[PDB]
DNA sequence: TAC
C-alpha cells in the first residue's frame, strides 16, 4: 500500500482557509496532513474545519493566543497521540505532535525561530537537543520514525538562493547547521535529497521584494526518516505551486506492504 | 515531464576536466548537456570523457585542431543529427549542432567571435544570417526550436557591465546588437529574460582584474525558443556560482 | 579589462 504525508506551514490556518485551503485539502487527498502555526484557539475554529470527512484531526495550540500551534489530520487511526518532549518550557508552545500509527512514529513539529533574539536563538538550539533526545529514544527502543515540519533551517548552501548574505543571520548560521548534520550522522536521512540533488528547490520565500517568483527562498521544511526505513520511502517532494502562505506543503509517499 | 538542458561554454574540455567537470556533470544531472569550445581532439580524448555512463555523446571538431568544436550529451539519443548549415566555410569550424528530439530540434551553436580583425567581424555576421536562414527555414516546416550557446554579443545595455567602454568593441556594436533586435523580431524570445529583468545577470567574466569576482561581466550565452513553444519553458536561469571557465553555464527546463 |  502506499501512504501519502503532506507537511504544511500555513502561517495560520484561518488565514489560509479563507484562501480555499479545504478545496486544495480535497485535491489533494494525504492519508496524513500535517500542518504548524495553527494560531487559532481550535475550540472555535470552523466545525468544516475541525471536522473533515473522512479523517479524524487533533489540534495542540500554544499556551500563549494566536501564536505557533500545529494540527494533524488523519484517515489512519492511531494507537497514541503524545504532545511533547516531556520537558515543560519545550511543551507549552504548541511545537509537538507525535503520531503512533504502528509501522512507525510520526513526529510533526513546529521548531522555534530563532531570529528574534539570543533567548530565542538559545531556546531553538535547546529545542534541537530535546528532540534528538527523544526521538533517538523511541529508535532505539526499535521503532521506525518519521519526522516532518519546519526546522527553521535550511542545512547547506544549496538550500537558500543567498547563503553568504545570511552566514551571520538565524537559519543558516554554522550553529544550526552542524546540528542538523549531527541528527543525520545519528542514522536519519533527509528524504528529499535522496531523490533531488538540484539547487532552487525551497519551501519558504519571504513576502517582501516578490521573492517566490523571483524564486529567492530557503528549504526549512522537511522530512526526515531513520536509516533502517529509508527503503520504504517511493517518494519526497516540494508542491511549489500550492500558494496562500510563506511556506509551500512537501510532500512524503512511503510504501507499505 | 520536466526536461533539463544545461549550456556552458567550457574554454577548453581538457581545461575543466582537471578542473572536476565530470564531478559537477554527475552532480548537475542534466538530461541533455550541450559545450561550446571543446577545443580537443574527440578521438583522444580521455574514455571516462567521451563515454559518461547514461549519456550518449555527440562531438563536432572543427578541422583546425585545438580550435572551437562543440559537443552534446544526452540521456536520450536523437533521431537525427546535424552538423552544419549546409554552407562550407561556416561548417568546417565545428560551431554547429542541430540534433532532433522529436518535440524540438535543439540548436547547439558556438557563435564566432569578432574581435580579432575585421575579417572575422563580416565572418560573424555572415554566420548570424546563415543561422537565422536555417532556423527560419526548420520553423517554418512547424518544428518547435530551442537554440543554445554563445552567441558572442551581449543584447542590450543591461547585459554588460561596462556599456558605453565598449560600444566600439566586438560582441556590442550596434550592428550586432540590431541582428538579436532581427532574430527576436522574426519570433524568437529570449528566454532569460521572460523571468528575470535584473541586471547584473552576466555568463562571462574576463580572467583579468578579478572580473567575475568584482562581477564586471557579460551575458554572452543564451536559451532562445520560437514563440509558438515559449509556455513550456518553466524556467531559464544561470549557474553563477559554477567555476572552470570564463563563462559559467546557463539552465532551461522545459515542460513537454 | 576586450586583448
Ligand atoms: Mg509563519
Ligand atoms: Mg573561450
Not at 10 to 39: T, Y
Not at 182 to 189: A, T
Request: proline share 4%.
Amino acid at each position: 500500500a502506499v501512504l501519502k504525508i503532506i507537511s504544511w506551514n500555513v502561517n495560520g490556518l484561518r488565514a489560509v482557509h479563507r484562501k480555499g485551503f479545504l478545496k486544495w485539502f480535497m485535491e489533494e487527498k494525504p492519508d496524513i496532513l500535517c500542518l504548524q502555526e495553527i494560531k487559532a484557539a481550535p475550540e472555535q475554529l470552523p466545525r468544516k474545519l475541525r471536522h473533515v470527512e473522512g479523517y479524524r484531526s487533533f489540534f495542540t495550540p500554544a499556551e500563549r493566543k494566536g501564536y505557533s500551534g500545529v494540527a494533524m489530520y488523519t484517515k489512519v487511526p492511531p494507537s497514541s497521540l503524545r504532545e511533547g518532549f516531556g520537558v515543560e518550557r519545550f511543551d507549552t508552545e504548541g511545537r509537538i505532535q507525535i503520531a503512533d500509527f504502528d509501522d512507525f512514529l510520526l513526529y510533526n513539529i513546529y521548531f522555534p525561530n530563532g531570529k528574534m533574539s539570543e533567548e530565542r536563538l538559545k531556546y531553538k538550539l535547546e529545542f534541537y537537543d530535546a528532540f534528538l533526545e527523544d526521538v533517538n529514544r523511541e529508535r532505539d527502543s526499535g521503532r521506525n520514525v518519521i519526522i516532518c515540519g519546519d526546522f527553521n533551517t535550511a542545512h547547506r548552501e544549496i538550500d537558500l538562493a543567498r547563503p553568504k548574505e545570511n552566514s551571520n543571520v538565524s537559519g543558516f548560521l554554522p550553529v544550526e547547521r552542524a546540528w542538523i548534520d549531527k541528527f543525520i550522522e545519528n542514522g536519519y536521512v533527509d528524504t528529499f535529497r535522496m531523490f533531488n540533488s538540484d539547487p532552487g528547490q525551497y519551501t519558504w520565500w519571504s513576502y517582501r521584494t516578490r521573492a517566490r517568483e523571483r524564486n529567492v527562498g530557503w528549504r526549512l521544511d522537511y522530512f526526515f526518516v531513520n536509516e533502517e526505513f529509508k527503503g520504504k520511502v517511493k517518494r519526497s517532494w516540494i508542491l511549489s505551486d500550492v500558494m496562500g502562505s510563506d511556506h509551500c506543503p512537501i510532500g512524503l509517499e512511503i510504501e507499505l506492504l
